[PDB]
Ligand binder design. Structure first.
Ligand SMILES: [Cl-]
Ligand SMILES: [Cl-]
Length: 323
């Protein structure tokens, strides 16, 4: 599809821009939305930012977080959708795709290329890294606030420099941003040192349901909808739980099944050394990365999804072991 140079040209040609992120926004969504919005505003453009979803509490102290609106009153010339793989992921703003020329910028290999112009590069760990390069190509100069906001998505999507994607390019980008004043400690404190007591109790439920398979190489658990309700939690509160299960010594693949809301089952998969969970996810209707992937089902009992997913995982695991 289009490369960065074409996207930079299109952005340079329009001065009234609506930047839209996806529902259930994460660090890379917030980082990409705000870094692009503020970068474009430094070029003098009139820019609003929007997400059709509540912003998670861990973002509440971030500079300019209030710039992300739920109901922008705005007549944009250009819609720029960041970090969203498909039109359904941007909620009510998908209606604008029929009316406003659109740019898509994303790192997800599952992106449906739904914009008029699309720059999709799955070699980046974070869409925020693509925004960083676009801002530089446009001539934007960062201050510490913009550096912090752009650092956020690189940090969150690499697990704060822990996952397999924490490579030279990630460390180069992070060093550049920290040199420009990015507050790495602030970002870690707000994202990671903000636990609710209810989250400890919710993870205790996960451990109570934990099952090991294949001589300890596979671990899985689940959170049904009533269990979220019992602890005054949503699927916001189980973020990172599946990584805790992968962190068990000897576990190669961890899987967590999450029902929220009723009958919506999200399956999060993580692997350690060799098992390609993106292949298992894709075969089930989802996708992702070799070490972290997922799939989402609508209209199914958690009791039906769990054994079907575990069955396919076990068959793929046995096939993988046989060299
Ligand atoms: Cl990775
Ligand atoms: Cl995780």
């Amino acid at each position: 599809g289009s490369g960065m140079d074409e996207i930079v040209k299109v952005l340079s040609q329009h001065d009234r821009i609506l930047v839209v992120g996806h529902i259930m926004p994460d660090g890379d969504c917030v980082s990409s939305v705000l870094s692009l919005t503020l970068g474009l505003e430094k070029l003098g453009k009139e820019v609003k930012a929007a997400v059709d979803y509540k912003i998670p509490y861990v973002f509440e102290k971030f500079p300019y977080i209030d710039k992300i609106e739920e109901n922008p009153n705005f007549d944009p010339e250009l819609l720029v959708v960041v970090n969203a793989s498909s039109p359904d992921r941007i909620g009510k703003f998908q209606d604008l795709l029929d009316k406003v020329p659109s740019v898509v910028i994303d790192h997800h290999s599952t992106n449906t290329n739904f914009g008029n112009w699309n720059w999709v590069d799955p070699s980046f760990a974070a869409t925020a890294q693509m925004i960083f390069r676009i801002n530089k190509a446009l001539g934007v100069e960062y201050d510490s606030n913009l550096a912090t906001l752009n650092y956020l998505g690189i940090a969150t999507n690499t697990g704060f420099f822990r996952h397999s994607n924490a490579d030279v390019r990630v460390f180069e980008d992070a060093y550049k941003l920290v040199k420009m004043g990015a507050d790495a400690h602030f970002v870690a404190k707000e994202i990671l040192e903000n636990k609710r007591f209810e989250q400890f109790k919710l993870f205790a439920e996960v451990l109570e349901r934990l099952q090991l398979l294949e001589n300890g190489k596979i671990a899985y658990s689940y959170i049904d909808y009533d269990t979220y309700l019992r602890h005054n939690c949503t699927d916001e509160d189980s973020a990172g739980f599946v990584g805790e299960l992968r962190s068990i010594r000897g576990v190669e693949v961890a899987v967590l099944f999450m029902e929220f809301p009723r009958g919506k089952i999200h399956v999060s998969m993580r692997s350690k050394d060799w098992f390609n969970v993106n292949e298992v996810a894709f075969e089930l209707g989802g996708g992702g990365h070799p070490r972290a992937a997922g799939v989402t089902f609508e209209g199914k009992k958690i009791e039906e999804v769990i054994p079907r997913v575990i069955n396919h995982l076990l068959k793929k695991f046995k096939e993988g072991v046989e060299s």
